[PDB]
């Protein structure tokens, strides 16, 4: 419906343009074609949205949970009617294949539903008192106005996980989508508005991170920021947020290890590895970005892995439902992947396959004979350039897996219960998966990292933990003597 | 003479720089204590890091064993800790006795719970998938503490943090280093493996900042001034380390018209003025319903008048000892000087000699007085009269702080409605503002900080969740589609 | 729904059918004895067939992901939303409930189904610390198996659906036998389930006599658990019969809840509340305020205001309009029992302040003062509209009277004093207690249940889940070790 | 030896006694009470009188008592080990383990006493506070067996005491001195009178009186399934709840990828420790055909090495004697059936006095008594299976479902088998009788209901109590004529 409606901000129940009126033109990464004019908001716009959410907060937090749940179920109903719209935009604006965006839309449905389901069930605790005649309990309360700042790779699911769960437990929301995915953010507003949430409870401000996002992060009426993006941005936001003592949730990068032992079905290992390391062009935080394989099956693994990679079809992702890979999000991502490929070649790496690019498209590029000094070993490679590392034993497997600043997810493939468990215990990561892909994700599990991959957990009640606080309350039923004045 | 404790060894700071600490009671010398630098902090940090794996991997029952031994040791040093809390900290007998009893309970509480911190088994939305969540320790944890309750605050942090398999670098407040050194004495005698607990005595902005900015420190739990906390949270950003921040308070104590007024004044005096008002959850702003204010004010001032201020070493019946240092006396004078100049009525107190200060009580206060706007960490207190419960709440919430708070009343509806409406991390009906148990979530909102400490809440602060799955079936994948 | 058009049948393994024996009886309205429908009179073979159907379906139903059972329950919720007018009409004409009563039960039933659906994916086990090195130690939740659901006639929809929806949610299958006085409500439940398309045998309905059909369920070896709401005696018999095959039970038995009123209350408000709490659904509520206890200082004005509001209650054909206050008792036997209660009180010198008449199945609320502990209406559950008011001198006395009963389901105190409220809440012996509200407060996710003769276990949300699942400790050991025998080694 | 009722050691009301002898050589051990119903009634009435003051002190006081009881137990360790051997037939190593685990049980109960939490709920109603308290059930009956009399009794007693129930304890008639020593320990620990009561007597007399009494709120029982069914039915008269820890016939499944020698060594410990007289003994050994030959050879090899002797002679005795001659008779019955049905007796069968040499059978089928019944003694069948499906079918072909184990290195096979085997507990690559102080221990099917260990014990002997506070007034629907 972009052919009949202007893309706008959503502030205090109203779709409207930024106060300056300034806009930019969102183009498709597929063919550079125009998608829509979109707001280029500034600080006054963020402030208006923040004030709207702050003024809406008390009423929203004080209604019974069941009523917030009702609003989220209504949102879910609206989402279901809007699925194709979301799929269409995820593809032409974000470059996602039919399969990727179908996955994203199906998961988003589950996220909204999960948030609705859990709203009424987030519990506090009744405690024993060490004192006589004392009732001692612990309540759960909303943090307040919550800033939601998101990336471009899974813009729908990542945004809605944060928005629906944050809204469910009685916070209001100021939402700033990634500048490469603004129409997705706008469709989210369309959804919310049609679900008729009270004005100010949810607000959309479209504009630059360093301007609109920074305002959200430094404003005293914002209680908490939940953020998903680059670790460098996370560190910046964490620093900025300190000024007003607001808490943060930081879902940052990853360089996930996929560990492949010698007792596996090697053909299966390769099929799983291709999917985990290259789905959505590798632009996934929990992409299998460093493939680690036991020497005993390495030659056969490498051959199969490449075989299946050679079958990957790259095309305009609107062409049909069977396209494997779309383009990268912009030209900067292409240039960066060229730097990764060139650095790996210069250092003596063997390029097994791929390496061409055109427009924003970038082929899978696979390397062996890499060492720890390679950029594609030291940095997050948010794209389809992937190293394969050969190791002699499980000790080395772990050493390499852990030889990174990151610590989001990870996986081992093996049929041996002992090796599976020891490697799982020893790999330093927020999440781990035995015999599955690295990017496994469920709507209600604690999703998050350690080390440079961030802080906190999201999904279900973990999302609730991030944006509530505990409130110890006592009642004393007896009177007592006090120690001062002692002369009594 | 006092030393650091690093990797199982009591040792001098690497520069040998020492410093003479004195007693707030009479200026007489107490000890020679380290003046450590960044290099010392790093040595403790590297120790803790290298002890971490062995410490975290032993079964929890083992860590609990160490803590029970520590409890055993602590119980033998009770009077030592009491003496130093009085001599170095200026605490009265009753105050330090209370602190030593609470400390006994804190260490015991952490031992009790070590074996019992659980993860979760989850339902999977997928077929043939086991899906569970483990608890894992954060790593090496910096522990930075204040001077007012240096023993109990330090131990709640040290003991609970150790319990769940974290190693510790500890830096006590510069005015209470000997309390710190005794803590290391107790830990050493409990025989915890080397590097698991490290003490470094040095300046906050040098040693503390090293802990806060170091790459191998996973988490810092901190108690102190709100401004210090904001600084610490900002420095922590660089390494994405997490923080627990227990900062200031300006706790409201609300008194309604249906109370036992005499009882209310007795409660108010203890809550507002215990330990000379140098308590984070001290009742720092007293708020009273107009219908009982005159009688309440007369009674409160009457019991304040009965307070005995003296050398806390003299005997067990001393109500108030001195403030910790001359900077605190200077600050209290500012609060009084400001209140007088804004038209406050000074009902009693204000006398100060050396570090001693007689509780100064004000009425005819308005929201612009520094003693209404700022945390008053000492014995200077406003009483404010309100007309109804709405104004009581408005005044209670008219602060940047939000640590604790309390209401005195026999009406169930007024009590609950006021508990609910008051913006604080903790609240208490018919008791003091500074109630504290070993295992309850202790902490604030607004400028009073972030996180909760006490029992399993301390465990939450210094561990993380780790989602682990096992998939028991193989499946087909969407790429490549030509398959 | 046309009452003359209804073909009422069992629902077993996916199909509506007649009892194997072809037997039936006629269900009549308690309002005027009008025929409602012929309904099955099933026997043991029908119960066995349902049980076998539930058992055979168990593994496929338990092993699917929780999310898939929630989907079924959401679908059930969708169907129920369409069937509301139908459910309300049968609750009124078959159960004798007023419009306002049945509207309330249907609204609550919708919340109960939704609640079970919401929680299905979120019932968690535990990851534990091991005292042994190299050991992983966890606790899974597993469904109990086939569960028998045996229900009463007073709130037949909401009590049935609480039990059924939560039980199904966590992967048990169900064999359900409604109260013989409310069979059509059970049949409409099976219609809802059938329309929601649950797999065959997951839910079964058998309409028949408790001592026949009900007993087969309780004694059968393929039944893992029985959840039962009814009379304390029936419960005690069920608990005994269940021991044979070591199946567990949930027992929601009678109450005789106290409503304690202190001297500091708004007395007029206390009176209005007490009328509602003591007499809604003609007192036919387990958590009805069955023994009103008031403080001497407000007793006289309280009794005046309370009797005044009772006098205002409109007794009438509950089908007539929406504003009828009270309808008939469920049947003639209930009227006769209430007559015994009234007669025993009059005979013992109790003072009857109002009511005590009755016509057909309709009974006029009878209020007594000047009673003592030997009165039957103080010693027994009075499941109908006969209520004693006891006057007390102080809070200690209020508590002693409150606790002087074999029962222990719920309770309430009215007071504005936080200390008296909490101390009374603490001293009263009941599974549930409400400060400044009615005795029969109930939410979909709270633990509902009693102590003493009022039963065992709790229902509502995760507590229903606790009843019909078990904990399963599983360990993995990652190191080999030496063993102490043979020591020669 | 006497009863312990309301703070006093005393002989039975009737004065009736009996002589308990050693299973090892028949010699006299002690005279013990033969109590009757009046004794059980005196104990119950005492527990009941004592309940309210015990349930209402703070949890921390009860924990304190348990910590006291723990220190007494530590002093009494050798006395317990001695009696468990001479009265129980236990070897040194067995009774050492029992006492070591009993120490952990008492400690564990103490640790958790302060931490049993209720819940704060969201209300679907406005202005409503909704919470759930934990309340102790009341007077609790504790009825126990003879095979692990100390640890089994102490798990039940310690945890039941912790959360504020009082106890009436009737031990197994073949292990009464262990029950008396437990009353010694409790008395020395100084629990308030009536809180713990010991009544030594006949199960059908004393036990039944306990199970049927109005003032007993709950019964926790460990024993034979038939007994459990008896108790469950008698319990119904007073609607008291029960915990039933009944028999087991646990499967030990061995797959073809194991270290066969290790599997054999594990099986021998698992199947025959304490003469196989353990609920969770590996009583049905199931081995994959591809390693069945080697496994059976190694297994019999290690069984032959078992040294059977007077358990009092030294610390390296593997097996002592069965508890009484009736057990030996039952074991002969089991062997006589298996021989009659075509079983091959590979080793053992010999018996003298109460001693019995472990009898191992192969060529068995499902109709053998040693496959259909719990074999609570040293007769064990080995069954060979052709695949995992068949392993599970046999494993599940029993009325019992207590524990179970699989030995394998394949993650898939271990998990698939774990979830398929119908039991309350399951262990991968370990013995079937793993037990920790705080885990949920209990079975399904004929093996019992409920769970014991730490907070699971707490769930069994407490109830949830929903309480609300409604803060607003409202209009009610009747009388409808009322505005
Ligand atoms: N605690 C609670 O939550 C709660 C809630 C509501 C009501 N109640 C209690 O329910 C009671 C009134 O209901 P009611 O007259 O329906 O009670 P009931 O006579 O005990 O009947 C309850 C159910 O048990 C069945 N039944 C009867 N005998 C049986 C047997 N030997 N084996 C198995 N099932 C058998 C009945 O079938 P038939 O109809 O064929 O007899 C009925 O479906 C009151 O005491 C009330 O307090 C309790
Ligand atoms: N699930 C577990 O955790 C577990 C652990 C260990 C053992 N067990 C089981 O316990 C069984 C062997 O022990 P056992 O020979 O002592 O079993 P038992 O014959 O049932 O005796 C157990 C206890 O119940 C008492 N008792 C007997 N009849 C009673 C009655 N009618 N009412 C009340 N109490 C009565 C007994 O007293 P008297 O001695 O005077 O007869 C004894 O103290 C085996 O099945 C074993 O598997 C289970």
Q: How buried is D43 (Cβ within 10 angstroms: 0-12 exposed, 13-18 middle, 19+ buried)?
A: buried
Pocket (CB within 6 angstroms of ligand 1): C 150-154, 159, 177, 179-180, 209-211, 214-215, 218, 229-231, 234, 237-238, 252-255, 286, 381, 383, 409, 450, 455
C-alpha C156 – ligand 1 centre gap (Å): 10
Q: CB-based burial of residue D309 (10 Å sphere; 0-12 exposed, 13-18 middle, 19+ buried)? A: middle
Tokens 């499941």, located at residue: C383
Question: Are B88 and B23 contacting, i.e. CB atoms less than 8 angstroms apart?
Answer: yes
- Preferred mutation among D479, D481, D482, D483 to probe C, highest tally of C CBs within 10 A: D479
Cβ neighbour number for residue D394 with a 10 Å cutoff: 18
C436 to chain D, any CB pair closer than 8 A? The answer is yes
- Of all residues in chain A, the one with the smallest CA distance to B455 is A127
Q: Provide the shortest C-alpha distance from residue B76 to chain A (in Å).
A: 23
Cis peptide, bond prior to residue A318, ω within 30 of zero: no
Distance CA C364, CA B461 (A): 62
Instruction: Determine the Cα–Cα distance for residues D359 and B137; give it in Å rounded to an integer.
Output: 49
DSSP letter for D20, please: E
Structure tokens given for B470: 């096992």
Q: Which atom of ligand 2 sits closest to the CA of residue D231?
A: 32
C441–D contact, CB cutoff 8 A: yes
- CA dist., res. B483 & res. A270, Å (int): 13
Q: Ligand 2: which of D153, D176, D224 to mutate, judged by most atoms within 8 Å of the beta carbon?
A: D224
Active site residue B112: no
Question: What single-letter DSSP state applies at residue A132?
Answer: T
Residues C445 and D132: beta-carbon distance below 8 Å = no
Whole-number Cα distances in Å, B440 to A49, B106, D63: 37, 11, 18
Instruction: Look at residues C212, C216, C215, C154 and name the one whose alpha carbon lies nearest to residue C181.
Output: C154
Q: Do B429 and A476 touch (CB under 8 A)?
A: yes
Give the three-state DSSP class for B429. strand
Experimental method: X-ray
Q: How many helices (H) and strands (E) does chain A have?
A: 15, 22
**What six digits make up the tokens of D41?**
């009634």
Query: Which residues of C carry out catalysis?
Result: 252, 286
> Which one of the listed residues A17, A215, A285, A379 is annotated catalytic?
A285
Inform me whether the C-beta atom of residue B470 falls under 8 Å from chain D C-beta atoms: yes
* Spatial separation of the C-alpha atoms in residues C413 and C422, rounded to whole Å: 9
Residue with tokens 């699925």: A83
Compute the distance from residue D248 Cα to the ligand 2 centre, in Å.
Answer: 13
Question: Which tokens is D329 given?
Answer: 């008779």
Radius of gyration from C-alpha coordinates of chain A: 24
CB C91 within 8 A of CB C281: no
Q: Are C132 and B59 in contact (CB under 8 A)?
A: yes
Q: Are B352 and B304 in contact (CB under 8 A)?
A: no
For CA atoms A202, A206, A208, A211, the dihedral sign is: negative
CB within 8 Å: B125 and A462: no
> Nearest Cα to D48, choosing from D154, D118, D137, D173?
D137
Q: Write b or e for each residue in B227-260: b if 16 or more Cβ atoms lie within 10 A of its Cβ, otherwise e.
A: ebbbbbbbbbbebbbbbbbbbbbbbbbbbbbbbe
Work out the number of other CB atoms within 10 angstroms of the CB of residue B345.
Answer: 12
Q: What are phi and psi for residue C208, nearest 5 degrees?
A: -175, 175
* Distance in angstroms (rounded) separating the CA atoms of residues C69 and C170: 8
Domains of chain A: 1-253+443-488 (3.40.605.10), 254-442 (3.40.309.10)
DSSP of C424-458: HHHHS--SEEEETS-TT---TTS-B--SGGGEE--
C-alpha span between B237 and A225 (Å, rounded): 14
What part of C 301-360 touches A (C-beta under 8 Å)?
Answer: none
Q: Outline where DSSP puts E strands in D137-195.
A: 139-143, 166-170
Which secondary-structure segment (H or E) carries C380?
none
**How many other CB atoms sit within 10 Å of the CB of residue B451?**
25
What is the three-class DSSP state of C154?
Answer: coil
**Peptide bond just before C486 cis, omega within 30 deg:** yes
Nearest chain A residue to D466 by CA: give it.
A126
**What is residue C193's three-state secondary structure?**
helix
- Sequence-separated (6 or more) residues with CB below 8 Å from residue A280: A96, A97, A100, A153, A154, A287, A325, A326
- Cβ partners under 8 Å of residue A319, min gap 6: none
CA distance B112 to chain D (A): 5
Please give the C-alpha separations between residue B174 and each of A11, B37, B201, in angstroms, as whole numbers.
Answer: 50, 13, 7
Backbone angles phi, psi at D204, to 5 degrees: -65, -10
| Preceding amide of B480 cis, omega within 30 | yes
How many angstroms away from the CA of C140 is the closest CA of chain B? 7
The 10 Å Cβ neighbour count of residue D13 is 16
B415 in reach of chain C (CB within 8 A) = yes
Q: What is the CA radius of gyration of chain B?
A: 24
For residue B315, count other CB atoms closer than 10 A to its CB.
12
Q: Is the peptide bond before C468 cis (omega within 30 degrees of 0)?
A: no
CA angle C177, C179, C180 (to 5 degrees): 105
Contact A478, A135 (CB under 8 A): no
> Do residues B157 and B453 touch, judged by C-beta distance below 8 A?
yes
Q: What does the alpha-carbon distance between residue C120 and residue C116 come to, in Å, rounded to a whole number?
A: 6
Q: Which ligand is nearest to the CA of D441?
A: 2
DSSP string computed for A377-394:
HHS---SSEEEEEEESSH
Between the alpha carbon of residue B427 and those of residues A318, B419, C447, the distances in Å are 58, 6, 27
- Sign of the CA dihedral A268, A269, A270, A274? positive
Q: Crossing angle for the helix pair C99-119 and A98-118, nearest 10 degrees?
A: 130
**How would you classify the pairing of strands A411-413 and A431-434?**
parallel
Looking at the DSSP assignment, which residues form a beta bridge with residue B143?
Answer: B170, B221
Do residues A283 and A329 lie in contact, with contact meaning Cβ atoms separated by under 8 Å?
Answer: yes
Among A242, A274, A473, beta carbon nearest to B233:
A242
Q: Of A8, A6, A35, A4, which Cα lies nearest the Cα of A206?
A: A8
- For testing the chain A interface, which of D162, D262, D410, D411 should be mutated: the one with the most A CBs within 10 Å? D411
Ligand 1 atom with the smallest distance to the CA of C230 is 10
Give the distance from residue A189's alpha carbon to the nearest chain D alpha carbon, in angstroms.
28
What are the structure tokens assigned to D170, written together?
Answer: 């009737």
Among C186, C208, C230, name the best residue to mutate to test ligand 1's pocket (greatest count of ligand atoms within 8 A of Cβ). Answer: C230
The catalytic site residues of D sit at 245, 279
Q: How far apart are CA D165 and CA D243, in angstroms?
A: 15
Q: How many A from CA of C152 to the centre of ligand 1?
A: 5
A411 membership: H or E segment, kind and range: strand A411-413
Q: Which residue of C has its CA nearest to B416?
A: C418
Strand partners, A27: A34
State the virtual CA torsion across B161, B164, B168, B174 in degrees, nearest 10: 10
Q: Are strands A357-358 and A361-362 parallel, antiparallel or unpaired?
A: antiparallel
Q: SS3 letters for B233-301?
A: HHHHHCCCCEEEEECCCCEEEEECCCCCHHHHHHHHHHHHHHHHHCCCCCEEEEEEEHHHHHHHHHHHH
Q: How many CB atoms lie within 10 A of CB C120?
A: 27
Other C-beta atoms within 10 Å of B87: how many? Answer: 20
| Residue B344 DSSP symbol | -
Catalytic residue flag (residue A466): no
Nearest protein Cα to ligand 1, atom 29: C210
Candidates B262, B281, B288; CA nearest to B387 is B288
Task: Output the six-digit token pair for D9.
Answer: 């050691």
| Cα–Cα distance list, A163 to A42, A108, A112, A172, B462 (Å) | 22, 11, 9, 9, 27
């Amino acid at each position: 419906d972009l052919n009949i409606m202007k893309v706008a901000n959503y502030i205090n129940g109203e779709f409207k343009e930024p106060s300056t009126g300034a806009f930019q033109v969102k183009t498709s990464p597929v063919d550079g074609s125009k998608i829509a004019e979109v707001p280029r908001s500034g600080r006054e716009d963020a402030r208006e949205a923040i004030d709207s959410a702050f003024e809406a907060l008390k009423a929203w937090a004080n209604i019974p949970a069941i009523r917030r749940a009702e609003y989220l179920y209504k949102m879910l109903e609206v989402f279901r009617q809007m699925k194709e719209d979301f799929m269409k935009i995820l593809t032409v604006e974000g470059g996602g294949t039919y399969r990727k965006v179908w996955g994203e839309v199906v998961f988003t449905e589950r996220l909204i539903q999960n948030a609705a389901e859990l709203a009424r069930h987030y519990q506090g605790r009744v405690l024993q008192s060490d004192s006589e005649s004392t009732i001692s309990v612990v309540f759960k309360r909303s943090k307040g106005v919550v800033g939601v700042i998101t990336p471009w790779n899974y813009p729908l699911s990542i945004s809605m996980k944060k928005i629906a769960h944050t809204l469910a437990v009685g916070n209001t929301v100021v939402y700033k989508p990634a500048s490469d995915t603004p129409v997705t953010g706008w469709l989210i507003a369309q959804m919310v508005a049609k679900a008729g949430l009270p004005k100010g409870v949810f607000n959309l401000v479209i504009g630059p991170g360093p301007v609109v996002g920074e305002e959200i992060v430094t404003h005293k009426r914002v209680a908490h920021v939940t953020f998903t993006g680059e670790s460098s941005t996370g560190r910046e936001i964490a620093a900025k947020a300190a000024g007003t003592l607001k808490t943060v949730t930081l879902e940052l990068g990853g360089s996930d290890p996929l560990i492949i032992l010698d007792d596996v079905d090697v053909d299966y290992a390769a099929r799983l590895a291709v999917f985990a390391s290259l789905f959505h062009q590798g632009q996934i935080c929990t992409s299998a970005k460093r493939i680690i394989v036991h020497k005993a099956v390495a030659d056969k693994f490498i051959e199969r892995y490449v075989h299946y990679v050679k079958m990957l079809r790259i095309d305009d992702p609107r062409k049909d439902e069977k396209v494997d890979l779309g383009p990268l999000i912009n030209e900067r991502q292409v240039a960066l992947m060229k730097e990764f490929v060139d650095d790996a070649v210069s250092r003596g790496g063997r390029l097994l396959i791929g390496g061409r690019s055109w427009g924003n498209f970038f082929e899978p590029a696979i390397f062996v004979d890499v060492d720890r000094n390679f950029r594609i070993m030291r940095e997050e490679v948010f794209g389809p350039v992937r190293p394969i590392v050969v190791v002699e034993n499980d000790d080395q497997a772990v050493e390499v897996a852990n030889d990174t600043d990151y610590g989001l997810s990870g996986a081992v493939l093996t049929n041996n219960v002992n090796r599976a468990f020891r490697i799982a215990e020893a790999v330093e990561s927020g999440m781990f998966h035995i015999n599955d892909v690295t990017f496994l994700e469920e709507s209600h599990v604690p999703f998050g990292g350690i080390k440079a991959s961030g802080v906190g957990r999201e999904g279900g009640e973990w999302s609730f933990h991030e944006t509530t606080y505990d409130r110890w309350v006592t009642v004393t039923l007896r009177t007592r003597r006090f120690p001062i004045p002692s002369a009594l």
